[PDB]
Amino acid sequence: QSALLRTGKQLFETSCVSCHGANLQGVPDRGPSLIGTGEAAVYFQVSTGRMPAMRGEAQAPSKPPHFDESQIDALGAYVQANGGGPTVPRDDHGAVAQESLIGGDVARGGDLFRLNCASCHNFTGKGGALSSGKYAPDLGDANPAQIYTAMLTGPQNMPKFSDRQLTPDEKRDIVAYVRESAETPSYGGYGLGGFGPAPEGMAMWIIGMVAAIGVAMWIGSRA
Amino acid sequence: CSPPGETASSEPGTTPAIWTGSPSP
Amino acid sequence: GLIKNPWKPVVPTAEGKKAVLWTSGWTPRFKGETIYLARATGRPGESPFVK
Amino acid sequence: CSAGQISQTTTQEPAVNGVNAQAGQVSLRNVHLRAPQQTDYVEPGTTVELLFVAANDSTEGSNKLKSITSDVGEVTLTGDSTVPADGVLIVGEPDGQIAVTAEVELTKPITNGLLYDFTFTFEDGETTVAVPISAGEQPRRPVPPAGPG
Ligand SMILES: CCCCCCCCCCCCCCCC(=O)OC[C@H]1O[C@H](O[C@@H]2[C@H](O)[C@@H](O)[C@H](O)[C@@H](O[C@H]3O[C@H](CO)[C@@H](O)[C@H](O)[C@@H]3O)[C@@H]2OP(=O)(O)OC[C@@H](COC(=O)CCCCCCCC[C@H](C)CCCCCCCC)OC(=O)CCCCCCCCCCCCCCC)[C@@H](O)[C@@H](O)[C@@H]1O
Ligand SMILES: CC(C)=CCC/C(C)=C/CC/C(C)=C/CC/C(C)=C/CC/C(C)=C/CC/C(C)=C/CC/C(C)=C/CC/C(C)=C/CC/C(C)=C/CC1=C(C)C(=O)c2ccccc2C1=O
Ligand SMILES: CC(C)=CCC/C(C)=C/CC/C(C)=C/CC/C(C)=C/CC/C(C)=C\CC/C(C)=C/CC/C(C)=C/CC/C(C)=C/CC/C(C)=C/CC1=C(C)C(=O)c2ccccc2C1=O
Ligand code: HEC
Ligand code: HEC
């Protein structure tokens, strides 16, 4: 659509050129070439608000989006027209696919996530630290399409998972595991963040031991 | 100390040959 | 009964039995044996590893 | 300390399979070979496709592409290989692109995984790239079912 292409260029020109160039070629030491990154890269980077970036540091954060859904489609169409690349999955009505991306095999998804994902995102997508100021974020806010395109495009320091390395059905199983491990309640009480020993040991010292010592003080005497 | 069996080389190296594979497990 | 020699040669390789720590699944069992880099499909059984 | 002159975000390269290259005043972005494969090699006599985008850093004048050569075969350029004042020249239609083309007639075999040298010559600038092969948005090819062993 030519209207969608001119709207995307018009949006791109006052938001993305300073770092990516007027012809999407990149501005050295400021931002990379966007040629061939595809609509999927635009969708992930703009729908999670990471783009436009605001400064250079170790890692660009996610933040509230600067554009709405149609503007994101326009920007993705404009970038797609310059080099192609992967696209964001759609549903019958041409909307970005969300529910149809939930795969049916969550046990396979969990096994795949633990092999490929939990090293950086933790057992249940709680986040983990990376080398020097970087970090794999908590996965609990990404929608299914965001998870899918994150695997598809390999953002910042996240490895790129092609549709040949992880087929679409494998990706859908992974997104089902990611979504279900975010929405499942804890079974044994308050989940304490899901990191395990460190918050459990914090809870013992600040709740259990404080209670036990306070009770000892109440029962015992001073001096 | 540094591990004695770990040094950088400057030789470029060649493309590996196609694997054929002998029989008899 | 607990004491075991770690360097007892027990692992078949292309040049004879070797101790466990010197070997792995990548050690050839005969000369020219073809060992594929296989990837985990995540489905237990039913071809867990493919080329 | 992560926001100094040596910054981790700002030197990041595009997460694409193609290669960047500086041909004088031309930026060569996303340069890659399309060459669907079946066995360990793509044999000589096959016609493969060389794709890229050429971006004019200058905004005053125009530029044109000549004489792409390689030691894998011969390259035929079809279409108007001129890149405009401050515009782009899309050569080939990449994987997800819904007519300048570079056709490579192969003389020695190529395989996905290795890099191959191509020399781009503009009327101002000329450089060698070492281009990869990119399967683009093609699906994973079936692998014959293994037996029981
Ligand atoms: C002797 C007594 C001993 C017993 C003590 C018992 C106390 C505990 C309570 C009892 C348990 C209830 C019964 C059954 C359990 C239950 O019914 O539970 C529901 C759910 O609950 C959590 O769901 C949150 C949402 O409901 C979900 O929607 C959401 O998805 C989920 O998100 C997680 O998962 C996602 C993946 O999808 C990730 O994306 C995401 O990031 C995150 O990880 C959420 O979890 P989370 O944010 O962990 O907690 C947030 C808590 C809030 O904190 C807590 O109350 C934790 C408190 C305990 C921790 C103690 C730490 C101590 C620290 C040290 C002191 C450090 C300081 C010392 C150094 C100082 C330095 C100075 C020198 O919510 C709130 O109420 C917020 C509003 C106000 C909080 C107040 C509640 C009670 C206490 C209030 C205190 C007084 C004033 C009020 C405070 C504001 C998760 O667990 C779920 O599994 C679980 O299903
Ligand atoms: C007092 C003492 C240790 C003297 C021994 C001297 C001696 C012989 C030394 C030689 C041995 C050497 C070299 C020792 C070095 C230290 C070492 C490596 C110790 C090995 C194990 C060991 C003996 C440890 C004992 C340490 C110890 C005495 C701890 C208790 C501290 C006290 C008095 C706490 C009560 C105060 C209290 C309840 C405070 C509120 C709650 C808080 C904030 C507690 C602090 C806290 C703690 C203590 C955690 O462990 C923890 C773990 C995970 C998450 C969070 C926390 C946390 O917040
Ligand atoms: C060796 C090593 C690790 C070094 C790093 C140490 C370090 C620099 C730590 C500080 C990190 C901070 C606080 C960063 C921000 C900068 C900052 C504000 C620093 C302090 C400035 C300062 C001294 C002045 C202000 C006054 C002052 C003293 C401030 C208070 C600082 C406080 C209270 C911060 C907490 C410090 C700290 C490291 C606590 C650890 C807490 C732990 C271990 C909890 C584990 C835990 C986690 C992590 C959960 O996710 C969770 C989820 C759900 C329920 C429970 C938990 C839970 O308990
Ligand atoms: C400078 C502050 C920037 C602005 C303004 C915008 N982008 Fe950016 N972008 C920048 C950097 C340094 C990087 C690389 C590291 C990173 O944080 O990911 C990027 C990355 C992208 C990507 C991903 C490219 C990939 O290789 O797939 C995309 C799709 C992207 N940027 C798009 C984009 C858009 C659409 C912007 C306008 C809204 C935009 N960026 C602004 C730096 C900067
Ligand atoms: C470490 C090398 C990683 C591995 C392996 C995986 N991920 Fe990751 N992921 C990593 C980083 C550093 C980031 C942030 C990048 C950014 O550009 O800011 C991410 C991001 C994601 C996201 C987006 C999360 C959001 O903020 O909502 C998702 C959904 C995500 N990663 C999922 C994911 C999956 C499913 C993985 C297994 C295939 C996986 N990641 C691997 C770091 C690393």
- Cα D70 from chain centroid (whole Å): 12
Q: Whose CA is nearest to atom 39 of ligand 3?
A: A202
Peptide-bond breaks in chain D following residues (C–N over 2.5 A): 98
Collapse the DSSP code of D29 into the 3-class scheme (helix H, G, I; strand E, B; otherwise coil) and give the result: strand
Residue labelled with tokens 């499942």: A184
Q: Are A36 and D30 in contact (CB under 8 A)?
A: yes
Strand C39-40 vs strand D101-106: parallel, antiparallel, or unpaired?
A: unpaired
Strand D82-83 vs strand D101-106: parallel, antiparallel, or unpaired?
A: unpaired
For A183, phi and psi rounded to 5 degrees? -100, -5
CA distances from A81 to A2, A9, D57, D58 (A): 11, 10, 19, 22
DSSP codes, A22-81:
TTSS-BTTTB---TTTHHHHHHHHHHTS--S----SS-PPP-S-SS-HHHHHHHHHHHHT
Q: Are A67 and A7 in contact (CB under 8 A)?
A: no
CA distance A197 to A211: 20
Q: Are A77 and C12 in contact (CB under 8 A)?
A: no
**In this structure, what token pair is assigned to residue D113?**
């995984």
Span from the CA of A213 to the centroid of ligand 2 (angstroms):
15
**In this structure, what token pair is assigned to residue A132?**
């020097």
CA distance A68 to A46: 9
> A16 CB less than 6 Å from ligand 4?
yes
Q: Are D83 and D89 in contact (CB under 8 A)?
A: yes
> A207 CB less than 6 Å from ligand 1?
yes
| Ligand closest to the CA atom of residue A202 | 2
CA distance D47 to A189: 64
CA distances from A34 to A6, A26, A105, A210, D15 (A): 17, 7, 35, 55, 9
Chain B neighbors of C13, CB-CB under 8 A? none
CA distance D112 to D39: 10
- How many residues are present in chain A? 223
Q: Are A23 and D87 in contact (CB under 8 A)?
A: yes
Which residues, listed in sequence order, are joined to residue D104 by a DSSP beta bridge?
A: D48, D75
> A199 CB less than 6 Å from ligand 3?
yes
> A129 CB less than 6 Å from ligand 3?
no
CA distance D68 to D49: 12
Q: Which of D142, D116, D112, D143 is nearest to D129 (CA)?
A: D116
Q: Of C42, C43, C44, which is closest to A115 when you measure between CB atoms? A: C42
Collapse the DSSP code of A216 into the 3-class scheme (helix H, G, I; strand E, B; otherwise coil) and give the result: helix
CA distances from A62 to A44, A139, A141, A146, D45 (A): 10, 12, 11, 12, 49
Span from the CA of C38 to the centroid of ligand 5 (angstroms):
24
**In this structure, what token pair is assigned to residue C12?**
């078949």
E strands along chain A, which residues? 128-129, 135-136
- How many residues are present in chain C? 51
Radius of gyration of chain B (CA): 16
Kindly identify which residue of chain D lies nearest to residue C51, measuring between CA atoms.
Answer: D143
DSSP state of A13: H
CA distance A38 to A24: 12
Q: Are A12 and A37 in contact (CB under 8 A)?
A: no
Q: Which helix (H) or strand (E) holds D55?
A: strand D47-56
**Dihedral sign from CA coordinates of D76, D79, D80, D82:** negative
**In this structure, what token pair is assigned to residue C40?**
């985990």
DSSP codes, C1-51:
-----TT---B--TTS-B-GGG--TTS-SSTT------EE-SSSSS-SEE-
Degrees to nearest 5, angle at CA A138 with D1 and A69? 100
DSSP codes, D39-72:
SS-BPTT-EEEEEEEEEES-SSS-EEEEEEEEBT
Residue labelled with tokens 């972005």: D29
CA distance D62 to D122: 11
Kindly tell me the number of DSSP H helices and DSSP E strands found in chain D: 0, 10
Distance from CA of D105 to the nearest CA of C (A): 30
CA distance C9 to C20: 7
CB contact A118 to C (< 8 Å): no
Chain D neighbors of C50, CB-CB under 8 A? 143, 146
Q: How was this structure determined?
A: cryo-EM
Collapse the DSSP code of A3 into the 3-class scheme (helix H, G, I; strand E, B; otherwise coil) and give the result: helix
Task: List Cβ neighbours of D101 (8 Å cut-off, separation of 6 or more).
Answer: D49, D77, D78, D79, D91, D92
- Residue A135: exposure state from Cβ atoms within 10 A (0-12, 13-18, ≥19): middle
For A202, phi and psi rounded to 5 degrees? -65, -40
Which atom of ligand 3 has the smallest separation from the CA of A206? 58
Collapse the DSSP code of D48 into the 3-class scheme (helix H, G, I; strand E, B; otherwise coil) and give the result: strand
Per domain, the residue ranges of chain D are 13-149
Q: Are C30 and C14 in contact (CB under 8 A)?
A: yes
> A209 CB less than 6 Å from ligand 2?
yes
Resolution in angstroms comes to: 2.3
CA distance D76 to D102: 5
Radius of gyration of chain C (CA): 15
Residue D15 annotated in ligand binding: yes
CB contact under 8 A, B22 and C29: no
CB contact C44 to A (< 8 Å): yes
Distance from CA of A129 to the nearest CA of C (A): 26
